[PDB]
Design a protein around this ligand. Structure first.
Ligand SMILES: [Ca+2]
Ligand SMILES: [Ca+2]
Lengths: 64, 145
């Protein structure tokens, strides 16, 4: 089955977009390159995770 | 919903962070310069995919109006149904409940491969009735609302 990775990716990408709205979430620990996380980073991070959610949406629609 | 408040100014700043040169358009190179600074290593194919989802016309770059359109989007139940379908792909019996071990497995080992600490926060947010299966219809609703 080939909708398995698209479905997983869609779940994972929605949750990461929903968890980024919590400033104390564990989802901020993945950015190991960045020493200290200022608010001008979290802006770009939320924008990126939103874009990643919309193509997780598009890839899943093309497989469901 | 509601009429956009000062979040227009919050999005204008956020738009300005990608728009390094100030020409009013976000390019693939401008998006890649931001992502690599965060430690990510995306392919030019991935950049084009992200840019194409938010570009409403065809000019291949994002302006601020399309940026606002994108940042102002939980499409009623229409986007709940899709997450509900994605969960159903792993609901082997078709009952509406998935095992904690199974959910932990798919989230850690395939797709976008989330960390163990993220999956812990994930299973924790759905207060398990003891050591029982997790209902994902409650997950979809907690996420969207
Ligand atoms: Ca530009
Ligand atoms: Ca455009």
């Amino acid at each position: 089955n080939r909708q398995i990775p698209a479905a997983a990716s869609l779940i994972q990408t929605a949750w990461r977009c929903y968890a980024a709205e919590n400033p104390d979430s564990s989802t901020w620990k993945i950015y190991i390159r960045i020493s200290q996380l200022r608010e001008h980073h979290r802006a770009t991070i939320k924008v990126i995770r939103r874009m990643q959610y919309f193509v997780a949406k598009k890839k899943f629609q093309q497989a469901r | 919903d509601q009429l956009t408040e000062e979040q227009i100014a919050e999005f204008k700043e956020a738009f300005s962070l990608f728009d390094k040169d100030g020409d009013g358009t976000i390019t693939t190179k401008e998006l890649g310069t931001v992502m690599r600074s965060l430690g990510q290593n995306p392919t030019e194919a991935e950049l084009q995919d992200m840019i194409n989802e938010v570009d409403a016309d065809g000019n291949g770059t994002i302006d601020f109006p399309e940026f606002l359109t994108m940042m102002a989007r939980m499409k009623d139940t229409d986007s709940e149904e899709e997450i509900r379908e994605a969960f159903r792909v792993f609901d082997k019996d078709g009952n509406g409940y998935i095992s904690a071990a199974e959910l932990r497995h798919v989230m850690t080992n395939l797709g976008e491969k989330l960390t163990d600490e993220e999956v812990d926060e994930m299973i924790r947010e759905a207060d398990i009735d003891g050591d029982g299966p997790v209902n994902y219809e409650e997950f979809v609703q907690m996420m969207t609302a």
